[PDB]
């Protein structure tokens, strides 16, 4: 469809979202009080009861509807660019489907988090537990990550090799589709996200010892292959040298919680920086990122209230 006509509806829906002060002042309400405050929020129609389980389930339903119902008058040609954003949820669903099928886990035991692929098709692919069968049951033309899956599916049948090829190949295919996309904002955001994911995987894999050519994700807009190899190695100075990009926050730190906090904050501050390009997919990306951040912060605050904890003990959970 039209990236501008869809941009209008996206602007309306993204203006129909909770604000920073709502989370700031709703942190005092606890248990049922916080549940009712959420019931007053944008996701308010979902909120039924009180407590962390129901709060999380309602937040999941609200996300799966509001952000999971993208193709309304945006599908068609622009669909192949919009779906590129919705990657991780479908990736987790498909990797879980492959692991469960190759490990004997029940089909109904798999959560099948809604995303790019249909949950009914995922349940079918549970029967189609073969690699090629799952690829066929997930061959979405508008999600060329299906191609990387089939190539991974055709790469082998062993679960470990299939998954290890699938993750990296799908990340590379998504990055390449973004590179070939006629959208500067989308290309920039996706490349910076790939670089940040490489840095985070290096930090969480510091000392893992895998070959940097494989472990260090390609397409780095922050750290090259050698720079990520050094980050995996004992080079904390790599973090300080990684300054000058939007990811300039790193400074001699091998930490992981702070790394996640900073990466989330920087990616949010970048995805919110495209507001000046409404006709482009920048509005769609801002809406998606804001919906995800609000959902995460709301679920964290709900758990904190249902278990008597402060939500903002880590600022990474406040609104980001």
């Amino acid at each position: 469809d039209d990236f501008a006509y869809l941009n209008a509806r996206v602007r309306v829906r993204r203006g129909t979202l909770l604000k920073e002060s709502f989370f700031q002042e709703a942190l005092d309400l606890s248990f049922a009080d916080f549940l009712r405050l959420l019931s007053e929020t944008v996701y308010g129609g979902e909120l039924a009861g009180q407590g962390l389980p129901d709060v999380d389930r309602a937040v999941l339903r609200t996300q799966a509807k509001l952000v999971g119902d993208l193709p309304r008058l945006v599908t068609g040609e622009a669909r192949e660019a919009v779906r590129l954003l919705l990657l991780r949820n479908d990736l987790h669903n498909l990797q879980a489907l492959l692991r469960a099928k190759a490990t004997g886990r029940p089909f109904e035991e798999v959560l099948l988090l809604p995303g790019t692929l249909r949950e009914e098709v995922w349940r079918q692919a549970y029967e189609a537990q073969d690699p090629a069968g799952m690829a066929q049951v997930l061959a979405v033309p508008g999600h060329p990550l299906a191609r990387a899956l089939r190539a991974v599916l055709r790469e082998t049948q062993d679960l470990a090799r299939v998954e290890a090829l699938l993750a990296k190949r799908f990340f590379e295919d998504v990055a390449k589709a973004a590179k070939g996309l006629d959208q500067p904002a989308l290309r920039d955001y996706l490349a910076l996200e790939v670089d940040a994911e490489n840095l985070r995987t290096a930090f969480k894999l510091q000392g893992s010892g895998l070959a940097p050519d494989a472990f260090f994700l390609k397409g780095g807009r922050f750290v090259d292959r050698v720079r990520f190899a050094r980050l995996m190695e004992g080079d904390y100075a790599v973090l300080d040298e990684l300054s000058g990009t939007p990811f300039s926050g790193l400074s001699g730190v091998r930490d992981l919680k702070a790394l996640e906090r900073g990466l989330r904050c920087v990616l949010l501050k970048e995805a919110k920086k495209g507001v000046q390009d409404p006709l482009g997919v920048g509005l769609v990306l801002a809406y998606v990122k804001e919906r995800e951040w609000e959902a995460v912060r709301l679920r964290l605050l709900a758990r904190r209230a249902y278990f008597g904890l402060p939500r903002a003990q880590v600022e990474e959970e406040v609104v980001c």
Partner: protein, 73 residues
Amino acid sequence: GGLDRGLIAVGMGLAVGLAALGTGVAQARIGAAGVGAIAEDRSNFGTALIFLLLPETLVIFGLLIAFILNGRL
């Protein structure tokens, strides 16, 4: 007549030809958006059709200019 007797005809034909581009522009986008949002916007299906039929004013004005030229010749 002589030069006028076909020059005015060409002037009206070019009038209509350049006018129809207005509809060709507007209606493509309007119809695409309406078809995209119709299945989810039954609350505006009539409104979508109204918005789609809105740009006929330019075609009407062009037909009016054509008729005025035909009367002038």
